[model samples]
Target: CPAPPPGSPDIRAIGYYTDAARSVIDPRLKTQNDAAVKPLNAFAAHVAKFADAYAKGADEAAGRCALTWLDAWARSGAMLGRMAHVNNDQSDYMRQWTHGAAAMAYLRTQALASEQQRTDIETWLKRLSAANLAYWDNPKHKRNNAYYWTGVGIMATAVATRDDTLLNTAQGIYRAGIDAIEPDGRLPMEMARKRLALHYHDYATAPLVLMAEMARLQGEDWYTYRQGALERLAARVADGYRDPSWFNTQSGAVQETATPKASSGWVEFYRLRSPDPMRFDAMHAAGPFQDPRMGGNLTLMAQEGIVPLPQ
Candidate 1:
């Protein structure tokens, strides 16, 4: 059998194959839940398809149709299937889908939808929020990649409902993400993941960048907050990703931080403020990063186009 590619997501209750690519095919090894990422990710994509069109102003026939689709899903229990993962994986996103997805539907299609639809959307948001608070509000590891997505939902829902508390809660999340970057520009929480530290760090930056853009849109000073801590971390990301061999060394294998890496979410946001032609070239090559969890539209919301951050 061929070797398991570096960081391939395949699993059967922790099974590995003749593919020696991942950890030299040790039968003693557990394959992990990379396969499980599929359906959940698929569900995220399904919802994002709706968000993408809805954000374009779900007022026309197409827009209203998109909300109708999502409204049916929300009414159908959000259509997220059960998971067998031990950690209640997607516990955060379970809430995020409702808030983020429903918020955009409300923002763009509320005027066009029926009262029953609006009520149902609000109900879904409330239930999803409760599920999130129950599961993700104060986890032992509260500041990782998933946490940022949680904040995105909170912030997005706040935007739709004019809920200052939820929005401020999300603001605090961004503030905390900013404060966590060390003097060396590494996030301590991400570093805890060992070889995948940089990978997780990149994933974590998407929402925080979105948070900054949200703050920017509202005429707030989030992108420039903490004396540019977020900027510094982003700088570290660009320089480090060029050759993250040191990360693999720490792992003793071809780790998750390899090519086709989650390259552009942070870069797209950074270039908005710090416009690196090199960064833009690489990012353009990587194309826009939707992340699906970041409302699947980083470029739409955060990409400031050719504009650079204020000097």
Candidate 2:
């Protein structure tokens, strides 16, 4: 077996499970659920698929292949990062960050050679990073949604650029988001979703956990905020996985469901910081690529073995 990349974020850690959840749930949303939810499901699946491939040990060639598909997916109206898609919807912004992170994931796993490849990838990364940063710099964006996506974009930028400005920006966004959570630890946005409360927990917490990992890497002190949020939320998800009664109170929402496969990407984020055995174990147990590996490659490349954290 090819040696695992050094500092490669444990992609298998169970910080969150997006693709798995969406795969299991998207058909329902498309056929039986609301239309608004369908697009989000599609977006989640895209990100989850990328995560799963990376987790299974995709190499540089494989990573490039995945990027080819992801680049198309971004333009397919399935992703929210496109300016035409972002509008005023908080979910759209969240999805934009998620897709941007996926793109970053693809670029991170490749070799930067040829002025053309380097220029193209750098431009793409910079654009996506700028989009994310734009949201952070905007009060309207910050007020609209203060949860995982902010962290997602920040973490992506930190990993891609290893820049202090981006890392600091991420830490600040997370601190601001933590303050948005109620004393009881429920994200207000999750509560606002009415019947889909549990889904909110799944979607929102994934990035929060990721942000904590980024914070730890940067020598920042936001891990507790993530831990507190996770403490309030993760067990509920675990209980829901085991039995239905522990699911969120929102009426009409699915119950007793496991965290979806895609959100599983977030597990690596949590594992690095908290060393949660269950999260780590669950991630590997979840398997790779709920759908087939997008490209026929595994063995992702990393400069320091694993994807390096920002300096």
Candidate 3:
């Protein structure tokens, strides 16, 4: 196998949250504290490389690329071992995001990975998943977009390992999220963002949609889960993007435009199942949908009609 590309093995991950609620961004921190998240950004880039190769039909190449990085991290115990967080749950969030990305990327090329690579990579992922699962099991953690992301992360690992116990926990998070959808499809926690409510709603939808997809592969239909509440949530977000006035009026703050990454990226997956014309155009306008946190190049996967796992 080719040598693994240069990567960050930094174990200290810091929170960039600018506010107590963790909803506000500290733009300066992102730039000023660059080193804090370099490892995460680096890992995401590697996962994206693997996803791009897989999307382009270069499965063996994708597997090699994924294993190259996975093997390096495995040997270093980079992401698998305990991490030092500068702020509470900061490193944990990074771990969850990387778990989701690495696990999904691996599933795409699992058939091509060598037995040794499989053993090392899967074992490393299992350890990472345990850490993620434990952190999220705490009821103290707020059930918000971050919580939704944790579900996606753990769900991906559950799918990769075929661990029913972990799968159930992930699915429980998915169900709780679906159940939290208001009658009008608003997520109360996200709506609390005031100005960025719409954006957070979109953000929260991505993982729920992903977890739903994973659940479907596991023979649990969640697209219409909770009396079609998930559909309602998607519709509400799509409407928010089409016209921010409603959100502005409701949130008492002008809504921000939809983010280009995984925020609007969830629409790609939703489109496949529901195919709303408005959202189809909305997703097209947001072209080249990809976010390493969501396993990279989600639009391509949706276009390919690819399910990461075999039915």
Candidate No. with top lDDT: 3
Q: Which residue segments of model 2 deviate by more than 4 Å?
A: 1-59, 64-82, 85-95, 112-115, 135-147, 215-229, 243-259, 268-311
Name the lDDT value of residue 131 in candidate 2: 59
Residue-level lDDT tens digits of model 1 in 23-128: 2343443234345345444544555555455555522554456456546656766523332334334433444543554454444345556778777766666555
Residues 36-99, candidate 3: write the lDDT tens digits.
Answer: 7676667766766775676676365665677678767766766655677665667777777777
Question: Cα-based RMSD of the predictions, in order?
Answer: 8.3, 9.4, 2.7
lDDT of 2 by residue, 89-114 (tens): 43445445444455445534444234
Between candidates 2 and 3, name the one with more favorable TM-score: 3
Q: Looking at model 3, which ten-residue stretch has the lowest summed lDDT?
A: 302-311
Model 1, TM vs. native: 0.72
Q: Between prediction 2 and prediction 3, which has the larger lDDT?
A: 3
Which sections of candidate 3 miss by over 4 Å? 5-10, 275-277, 307-311
Candidate 3 clashing pairs, residues 3+ apart or interchain = none
Per-residue lDDT of 157 in model 1? 61
- Candidate 3 TM-score to native: 0.89
What clash count goes with each model? 5, 33, 0
Alpha carbon lDDT at 64, candidate 2 = 50
Q: Could you tell me the lDDT of residue 53 within candidate 1? A: 52
Our model 1 lands, by Cα RMSD against the true structure, at 8.3
